[PDB]
Design an enzyme around this catalytic site. Structure first.
Site, PDB file in Angstrom:
ATOM      1  N   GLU A  74       0.805  -1.164  -0.052  1.00 10.40           N
ATOM      2  CA  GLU A  74      -0.070  -0.048   0.023  1.00 10.40           C
ATOM      3  C   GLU A  74       0.862   1.280   0.069  1.00 10.40           C
ATOM      4  OE1 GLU A  74      -0.083   2.101   2.671  1.00 10.40           O
ATOM      5  OE2 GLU A  74      -1.813   3.400   2.233  1.00 10.40           O
ATOM      6  N   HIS A  75       1.984   1.057   0.589  1.00 10.22           N
ATOM      7  CA  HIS A  75       2.877   2.248   0.930  1.00 10.22           C
ATOM      8  C   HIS A  75       3.653   2.513  -0.594  1.00 10.22           C
ATOM      9  CE1 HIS A  75       2.483   2.967   5.006  1.00 10.22           C
ATOM     10  NE2 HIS A  75       2.626   1.651   5.415  1.00 10.22           N
TER      11      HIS A  75
ATOM     12  N   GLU B  86       6.888   5.735  10.854  1.00 13.71           N
ATOM     13  CA  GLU B  86       5.337   5.759  11.129  1.00 13.71           C
ATOM     14  C   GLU B  86       4.781   4.925  12.193  1.00 13.71           C
ATOM     15  OE1 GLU B  86       3.288   4.854   7.579  1.00 13.71           O
ATOM     16  OE2 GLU B  86       3.997   6.440   6.377  1.00 13.71           O
TER      17      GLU B  86
END
Lengths: 411, 54
Positions: A59-60, A136
Site C-alpha cells: 500500500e505504501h 510511522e
C-alpha cells in the site's frame, strides 16, 4: 415521499463479470464527479508471520512507481487531473481508489490498472518505504485508541492469523525483502479476488469497457475467539483506554442487524462508543471508552449493566429508537460518491450482490424487542469477553470480576 | 480484589477446617481430652496427674 419510496428511488448498481473473473460494478448518478476504485479481498488475515507487513508495505509503495511510468510521473498525472489517489488496508480488505472528475474516468481507470497489474518495486523506493514505515510505527504508537484496538484483536484471536496487526512487527518490516512482496502480489492480487467499483457520474458500459482494456491482463487463475485480556499499564498517560468485546457473527449472518440495533440502543465516561467490527466468520461486538483513573470500574459497571438490560429487559420504545438510529446512520453514511463506491466494493467482497437499501429497511423492520433480547442473550449474555486496557489501568476490574459482571444473579 | 479470589481460597480453608473439626468430633471425640474430667469434682482429693488443657 415516504422512507420506503425514497429507498426505491435509489438506483441499482449494475454488476458484470469479466472473462478473467474481475467483477465490475457501478452505480449511475447525475453527479459531475466520480470515485473509481479496486477492492482486493486480501488483508492481514491472509498473511503469515513471515510477511505480516507485506500488504501495508505494498500500500505504501503502490503510488511510488509503476512499470509504465515512474512514481513522480504517476503522481504528477494524478495532480494535473485534479483527482485524489487514496488507499487503505484492513485485516481483510485492501483498496486503491481515485476520486476524480467524470470526464477523467478513462485515464483514472487505466491508472488503477498500472497500480495493480504492473507495480514497479524499486529497491531504492523499497528502502525509503522501510525508513518511512519505521518512523510511522513510532508515530502511531502515540495514538492510544488504535493501540488499544490492536491489543484487543491480538488478545481476542491470538493463535488465529486474524490477530496480527496490519502494519506488522518492526522486525518483520525490516526484513521484508522485495521477493516477498512480489510473491505476495502474485499470490494475492489476482482476479476474481478483485472488484472494480465506481459511482457518481459513471456509465456502467464505459466502466466495463475500461476494465476490459486496462484490467483484463490480470491472471485468470480456523478462526478462534479466546476470551483473554491484555493490560499495558502506563500511569503517566492522562486517561485510561478500555475496549471490551465479545465474539460476533461474520458478514454472512442475519443477526448483524439486531446487534447493530442493540449497539445503537446503548455520562460517567468522557468518550464512550460501541463497535460491531465484522469479519468473514468472526467478529468483535463491544465498547471502547476513555476514562479517568478513578472511574474505570463505574463505567465498566454501567456498560455491563446496559448489556444485561438489553439481554434481559429490552422494551419496545428503546428498540424502535435503535431501529430509527440505525436507519438514519445507514442512509446518511451512503452520502457522497466515495462512501457509496466503498460500500459497493466491500459489499461485493463480503456479502455478494450489493444488498440494496430496501432490503436493509425490511430487515430492520423485522427486528423486534423480543428478537433484540434473544440475539443479545445469544451473543452477549454469559460469554467470556476479550479485554484490552491501556494505562493508567489499575481500577479496571480483574478478568474474573468482568466475567462475573457478564451475567446477572437476579436473572 | 478480595471478592473473586480469596473468598474461594478462604471457603476452601473453611472446608478443610470443618473437615478437621468433624473428624476430631466424630472419630476421636476424646483425643484432646482428659478422662479425669469425667468424674464429679471432689474438693477433698486432687487427682494424681492434674494438668491444664493442652
Amino acid at each position: 415521499a415516504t422512507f420506503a419510496q425514497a429507498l426505491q428511488f435509489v438506483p441499482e448498481t449494475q454488476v458484470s463479470l469479466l472473462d478473467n473473473g474481475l467483477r465490475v460494478a457501478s452505480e449511475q448518478s447525475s453527479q459531475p464527479t466520480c470515485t473509481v476504485g479496486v477492492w482486493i479481498d486480501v488483508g492481514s488475515r491472509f498473511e503469515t508471520e513471515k510477511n505480516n507487513g507485506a500488504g501495508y508495505f505494498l500500500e505504501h509503495l503502490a503510488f511510488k512507481g509503476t512499470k509504465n511510468r515512474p512514481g513522480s510521473a504517476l503522481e504528477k498525472e494524478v495532480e494535473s487531473m485534479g483527482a485524489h489517489l487514496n488507499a487503505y488496508s484492513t485485516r481483510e480488505h485492501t483498496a486503491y481508489y481515485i476520486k476524480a472528475l467524470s470526464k477523467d474516468l478513462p485515464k483514472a481507470v487505466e491508472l488503477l490498472g498500472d497500480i495493480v497489474q504492473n507495480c514497479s518495486l524499486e529497491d531504492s523506493q523499497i528502502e525509503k518505504e522501510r525508513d518511512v514505515i519505521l518512523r510511522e510505527m513510532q508515530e502511531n504508537d502515540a495514538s492510544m485508541r488504535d493501540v488499544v484496538f490492536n491489543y484487543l484483536h491480538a488478545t481476542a484471536f491470538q493463535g488465529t492469523p486474524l490477530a496480527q496487526a496490519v502494519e506488522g512487527p518492526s522486525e518483520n518490516v525490516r526484513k521484508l525483502s522485495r521477493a516477498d512482496l512480489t510473491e505476495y502480489l502474485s499470490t494475492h492480487y489476482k482476479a476474481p479476488r478483485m472488484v472494480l467499483a465506481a459511482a457518481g457520474g459513471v456509465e456502467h458500459q464505459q466502466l466495463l469497457d475500461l476494465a476490459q482494456k486496462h484490467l483484463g491482463g490480470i491472471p485468470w487463475t480456523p478462526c478462534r475467539f479466546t476470551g483473554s485480556e491484555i493490560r499495558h499499564r502506563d500511569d503517566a498517560l492522562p486517561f485510561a483506554h478500555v475496549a471490551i468485546a465479545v465474539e460476533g457473527p461474520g458478514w454472512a449472518s442475519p443477526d448483524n442487524v439486531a446487534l447493530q440495533v442493540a449497539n445503537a440502543i446503548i455520562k460517567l465516561c468522557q468518550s464512550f462508543q460501541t463497535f460491531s467490527i465484522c469479519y468473514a466468520e468472526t467478529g468483535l461486538l463491544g465498547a471502547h471508552f476513555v476514562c479517568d483513573r478513578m472511574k474505570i470500574d463505574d463505567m465498566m459497571f454501567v456498560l455491563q449493566g446496559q448489556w444485561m438490560r438489553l439481554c434481559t429487559s429490552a422494551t419496545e420504545s428503546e428498540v424502535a429508537r435503535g431501529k430509527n438510529i440505525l436507519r438514519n446512520a445507514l442512509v446518511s453514511h451512503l452520502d457522497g460518491t466515495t462512501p457509496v463506491c466503498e460500500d459497493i466494493g466491500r459489499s461485493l467482497l463480503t456479502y455478494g450482490r450489493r444488498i440494496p437499501l430496501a432490503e436493509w429497511e425490511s430487515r430492520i423492520a423485522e427486528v423486534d424487542a423480543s428478537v433484540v433480547r434473544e440475539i443479545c442473550s445469544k451473543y452477549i449474555y454469559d460469554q467470556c469477553p476479550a479485554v484490552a486496557g491501556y494505562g493508567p489501568i489499575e481500577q479496571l476490574p480483574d478478568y474474573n470480576r468482568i466475567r462475573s459482571g457478564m451475567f446477572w444473579l437476579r436473572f | 480484589t478480595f471478592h473473586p479470589y480469596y473468598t474461594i481460597k478462604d471457603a476452601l480453608g473453611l472446608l478443610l477446617f470443618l473437615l478437621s473439626l468433624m473428624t476430631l468430633t466424630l472419630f476421636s471425640p476424646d483425643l484432646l481430652g482428659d478422662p479425669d474430667n469425667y468424674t464429679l469434682a471432689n474438693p477433698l482429693n486432687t487427682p494424681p496427674h492434674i494438668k491444664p488443657e493442652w
